[PDB]
Structures are given as structure tokens and as C-alpha cells.
């Protein structure tokens, strides 16, 4: 099928269910594209898949999409070169893709189960922007008879924090909203910091919504732990050194341009909660190599 069908299917899948990330939609679109092929040679199919991934990347500019596409491409073909009939190989790869899609969807519950035991009783928690996995973690924590208070940030320019505040108020939890310029003023009362992630880099740092770097520095100045929640399919191969090493195709969405993302160094992070387990920033270098088979 052509690119117009690809884009239409992608947008329809995104719009049908709001509780879904871009990566899952991209993976489902790629699987549907795989099921609608007619070729006879493997590398022609490889070229078609690469072109499809490249076209899909141009619509939405997020880090997770490209990494998910690459992981899907190199995970689908562990053993598909044995027989001489195209049909058997195609069936085997379709089965492998279905298995991969099945295995993708169990990460959030594992993350919540591993992370909910780090919250004390009667504690104040700071957070930035909106993230669904953090909400799941908090739901699991409140299901275990614990009490805490939450501070959130308005997170300009789209006021994303108020949405998370409204979602939190539905679970009768004390939640308050502060300004974007009062983070350092309010760090005094906090006890721990939990944020989401948009991509994990080779040296252990992260890429996230603009405004995380200053919060991390302020928390480091007063010796507060910094926790990160992420997923396996968000691992990318990149080794930035400063703020200007980030590729420009991720900074500006499709100074005065207001870049949307920023990078945080591994020396300001305490622990990482992934579906692979609990890893210090030093083990990410090995785990990324092992993952990229």
C-alpha cells in the first residue's frame, strides 16, 4: 500500500485511542504494511520497510519513533533465511512481529511494581510535566494504603501540568500547582523527584521536556534523589556532550524558536527504573549494547 494509506492508518490509530504512545502506533502501522506486501526477494522487502520507516518519521518528530522502527527491523529477522519459499519466511516474520507486539505491552505494570516500594509514608513528591507511567506508579502506590502530597509545574507553553493535576484530583490526593520560575523556591520542602523520559542515551543521560536541566541542578545543590522512569524501546544510540550536540531535527518542532527538549547528564541522576530492572547509569552502556542485537 502507498504512503497515503500509511499516514491515514497512523492518524486513525492515534485518534481512536488516546491512551497510547506514538511508538505503538508506528509499530502497528509497520506490521500492517508487512501484512500487505507481494514481493518475492527479501532485500526488496527490506528496502520497502526502510522507505516506510523514513516516511513515517517525517510526520512526527519524536525520539522514540526511530528507535522503535530500528528495533522492530532488526528483531524481526533472527532466523528467516532457511527455506527457499517466500511464504514460510513471511509467515515466520509475521509471527515474530506479533510476539514482539505482545511483549511490548507489559512494561508499565512491571515498572509500577518495581517502583512503588520507594515511596515513604507521609512524603512530598515533586514532578514535571505530564506522563502516564508516573500516573500509573502513583495509582499503584495509593492502592497500597499510603499517604503523600504532590507538587506539579504548569509546564509552559502548553500548560500540560494542569491536565495531570486534574487527573490526580480524581483520586483524592493532595495536589498543588506552582509556577515555572518557583522551582528553586519550592525545592526546600520536597523529598524526592520523579520525572518521565523521552529517550535514553549511551552515556546514561536523558532527553526530556524543556526545563528538566535546571530542576536537576537545583535538586543536586540540596542533595535530593533524582529518579527516572523509562521503557526499553526508548533506547537510542547517541553520545552528546553539551546542549548544542542534540540533533536539530529534535530541538525545533515541525531561543525565540523555543526548543522543546533538553539533555541531562548522567552525573545528576541517582537511579533508573526500566522494564529490564533497576540500573545505575553505569550499566546502561552495557545494556544498550546487549539490547541492539
Amino acid at each position: 500500500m502507498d504512503d497515503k494509506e500509511l499516514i491515514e492508518y497512523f492518524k486513525s490509530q492515534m485518534k481512536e485511542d488516546p491512551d497510547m504512545a506514538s511508538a505503538v502506533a508506528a509499530i502497528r502501522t509497520l506490521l500492517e504494511f508487512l501484512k500487505r506486501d507481494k514481493g518475492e526477494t527479501i532485500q526488496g522487502l527490506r528496502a520497502n520497510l526502510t522507505s516506510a520507516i523514513e516516511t513515517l518519521c517525517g510526520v512526527d518528530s519524536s525520539v522514540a519513533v526511530s528507535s522503535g522502527g530500528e528495533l522492530f527491523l532488526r528483531f524481526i529477522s533472527l532466523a528467516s533465511l532457511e527455506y527457499s519459499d517466500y511464504s514460510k519466511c513471511k509467515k515466520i516474520m509475521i509471527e515474530r512481529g506479533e510476539l514482539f507486539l505482545r511483549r511490548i505491552s507489559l512494561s508499565r505494570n512491571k515498572i509500577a511494581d518495581l517502583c512503588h516500594t520507594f515511596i515513604k509514608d507521609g512524603a512530598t513528591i515533586l514532578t514535571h510535566a505530564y506522563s502516564r507511567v508516573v500516573l500509573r506508579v502513583l495509582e499503584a502506590a495509593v492502592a497500597a494504603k499510603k499517604r503523600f502530597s504532590v507538587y506539579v509545574t504548569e509546564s509552559q507553553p502548553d500548560l500540560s501540568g494542569k491536565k495531570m493535576a486534574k487527573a490526580l484530583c480524581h483520586l483524592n490526593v493532595p495536589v498543588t500547582v506552582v509556577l515555572d520560575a518557583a522551582v528553586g523556591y519550592i525545592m526546600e520542602k520536597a523529598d524526592l523527584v520523579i520525572v518521565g523520559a523521552e529517550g535514553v542515551v549511551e552515556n546514561g543521560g536523558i532527553i526530556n521536556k524543556i526545563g528538566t536541566n535546571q530542576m536537576a541542578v537545583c535538586a543536586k545543590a540540596q542533595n535530593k534523589p533524582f529518579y527516572v522512569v523509562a521503557e526499553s524501546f526508548k533506547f537510542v544510540r547517541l553520545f552528546p556532550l553539551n546542549q548544542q550536540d542534540v540533533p536539530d531535527k529534535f530541538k525545533y518542532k515541525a531561543k525565540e524558536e523555543h526548543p522543546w527538549v533538553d539533555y541531562t547528564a548522567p552525573s545528576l541522576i541517582t537511579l533508573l527504573f526500566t522494564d529490564l530492572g533497576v540500573l545505575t547509569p553505569s550499566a546502561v552502556s552495557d545494556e544498550l549494547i546487549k539490547l541492539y542485537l
Partner: protein, 344 residues
């Protein structure tokens, strides 16, 4: 007349020639290696790269002329014969980790040789193995490292280098040939003054460059953007052993917020552990410290004075907290991840 702190380390001069005490038609030691050891005290020293190549060439030549004993095999005879050879070579000048790894590999190869083959077949196989080792472990690794490091250079940069090293010069020349524009700063230190090799090579290549001495390092760091360094060995805990003065540059660069990159191959990985830039070093000839003032040369006849010692170190150790990136033939990794990856 060594310092009490460095009493254990031996001190040697460059005028105590050891060749006077054996016959001109040498029989105790193979003549080619005698020539090599004589040359060790004059030059042929560059980051344990030329030294290892020369040692391997001499070993190949020695292996070429061998006779199988009537009541013995090659495996024990050659191993027992080689010990006085590099013992005398060590007596000439202390070795380096790369040579230790090379001789360990050669001994491992020698032991595994079976007795079924003929002498000529074994000799040819050993020569082929040595050629494969040198071809795989040095040249292709350098090409891969240059290819990897080409991606970290951008237009309008200012890169700082220290000392003389073939790898850095190769990387810079390849990057310039590829069509990128930048400029370089060279820092030198007494008494060897080895930065002039790099300065001349860069000038001949056609790259703008500046030159200065180590104590003024804090003067020019506001302009620099990157720091690029070589290495001599890689310790187990992740520290870096290099020429004296590297740690100062690392510390001042950290104080000025400048990233630091280190280039090395994977066959220099050592198994030693050190916690300070001291203890395990090598001393040199103190008379090189005499300044050629022209008139009233101070420190002349320094042995006449009662309490006066001259110190001359060769090496220092940099902790892993001052390094941000390491580039090897296997890719780019953080410093603290060196032992877990390379140990296998």
C-alpha cells in the same frame, strides 16, 4: 643520589655503555637484538608503537635462524633460550605494557605448537601468525578509530593537543583532508620538547596552528572547545597512564568546563591497579635538567653541594573522574565502563 621518596626506583645514565664488556663477534646475544638494544638508548621511542614493531621484527629475524636440538623440541628450547635476551633488553631500558602483552602472546603461540610438523613448517606458521597479529592489532584499529572520531569534529572548532603521538596527527590530517576547517593549539614542556614534531607535521599539512608552553595553559583555555589526548596504558580501575603533565591539563580543563577525549587501542589494557600518581614510575638522567643559560650556567657540578637532589619523572596517572569519553576500535564508551566491556 636518589630522593628518599623514590629510593626504590632505579636511576640510570646515558653514558654507562654496556657494550664494552662482551666480544665484538657477539655469541651470547644475537647481533640484531644487540643493535636494537644499543639503539634503545638513542631513540626509536614513540608511544610504545615503534618499539613494539622493532621488537617483533627482531624476534622474527631470530626465529628465522634456529636449529632443532637432537634430544629436544622447539616448545621448551625456544622458551628457555629467549629469557636472557629480553632480560638484557630490560637491562638496557625498562619495557612497556604493550611489549609485555606481545611477548605473552608470542609465548602462548609457541607453547601451543605441536611436534607433528616440521621445523620449516613451524617457522613459516610462526612468521604468518606474527604478521597477522601486527596487521590486525595496529593498522586496522587505527583506521577504525580515525573513522569513529571523524564524527566529533565540526567547522569552527579549536582543538588542543599535548606532546607527540602518531594517532592524533593521523586523525587530524585525515579530518582536514576530508574537507573540514579548524585550527590547533600545541602545548610543550621541558626538557624533551617533543611538541615540535607535531608542530612541523601540522604546518607541512597546511593547518593553522599556535604554539606555547605548559605553565601558560590557563591563559588560553577560554578559547578552546575540545581537548584530545593519547595514552600509554589503561589500568583495570579505569585510570589513564600518560606522560607527566597530562593530569594538570585535565584538572584545569575541568575547572574551565571543557570536555576531554582520550584515544587508545584495545591491546594496551593492563591488569594493574593504582590509586595515586606516584610509586610506580621511572626515573631519568638528571643532567638533562641543566639549563643552557649561555652565561653562568647554574646547577653546574651539582654533586659538589651537600644536600641537593634533582628529580625527573616520566609518567603520571589520571583518575577516571576527569575523562568524559574513550574511543577504541570497538566504539565510544564512558571511562568508568572500560573494565566491564573490555574484560570479556
Amino acid at each position: 643520589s636518589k630522593v628518599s621518596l623514590f629510593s626504590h626506583l632505579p636511576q640510570y645514565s646515558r653514558q654507562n655503555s654496556l657494550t664494552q664488556f662482551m666480544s665484538i663477534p657477539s655469541s651470547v646475544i644475537h647481533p640484531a637484538m644487540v643493535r636494537l638494544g644499543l639503539q634503545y638508548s638513542q631513540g626509536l621511542v614513540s608511544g610504545s608503537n615503534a618499539r613494539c614493531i622493532a621488537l617483533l621484527r627482531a624476534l622474527q629475524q631470530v626465529i628465522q635462524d634456529y636449529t632443532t636440538p637432537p634430544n629436544e623440541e622447539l616448545s621448551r628450547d625456544l622458551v628457555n633460550k629467549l629469557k636472557p635476551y629480553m632480560s638484557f633488553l630490560t637491562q638496557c631500558r625498562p619495557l612497556s605494557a604493550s611489549m609485555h602483552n606481545a611477548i605473552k602472546f608470542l609465548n602462548k603461540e609457541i607453547t601451543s605448537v605441536g611436534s607433528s610438523k616440521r621445523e620449516e613448517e613451524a617457522k613459516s606458521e610462526l612468521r604468518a601468525a606474527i604478521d597477522r597479529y601486527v596487521q590486525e592489532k595496529i593498522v586496522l584499529a587505527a583506521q577504525a578509530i580515525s573513522r569513529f572520531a571523524y564524527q566529533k569534529i565540526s567547522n569552527g572548532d579549536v582543538i588542543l593537543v599535548y606532546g607527540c603521538s602518531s594517532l592524533v596527527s593521523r586523525i587530524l590530517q585525515e579530518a582536514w583532508t576530508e574537507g573540514r576547517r579548524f585550527r590547533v593549539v600545541v602545548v610543550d614542556s621541558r626538557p624533551w620538547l617533543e611538541g615540535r614534531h607535531t608542530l612541523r607535521s601540522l604546518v607541512h599539512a597546511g593547518v593553522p596552528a599556535s604554539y606555547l608552553l605548559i605553565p601558560a595553559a590557563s591563559y588560553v583555555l577560554p578559547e578552546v572547545s575540545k581537548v584530545l589526548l593519547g595514552a600509554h596504558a589503561l589500568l583495570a580501575n579505569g585510570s589513564v597512564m600518560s606522560r607527566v603533565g597530562t593530569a594538570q591539563l585535565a584538572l584545569v580543563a575541568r575547572a574551565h568546563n571543557v570536555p576531554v577525549l582520550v584515544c587508545c587501542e584495545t591491546y594496551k589494557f593492563c591488569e594493574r591497579v593504582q590509586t595515586d600518581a606516584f610509586v610506580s614510575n621511572e626515573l631519568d638522567d638528571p643532567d638533562d635538567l641543566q639549563c643552557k643559560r649561555g652565561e653562568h650556567v647554574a646547577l653546574a657540578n651539582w654533586q659538589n653541594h651537600a644536600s641537593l637532589r634533582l628529580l625527573n619523572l616520566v609518567y603520571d596517572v589520571t583518575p577516571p573522574e576527569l575523562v568524559d569519553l574513550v574511543i577504541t576500535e570497538l566504539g565510544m564508551i564512558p571511562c568508568s565502563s572500560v573494565p566491564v566491556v573490555l574484560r570479556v
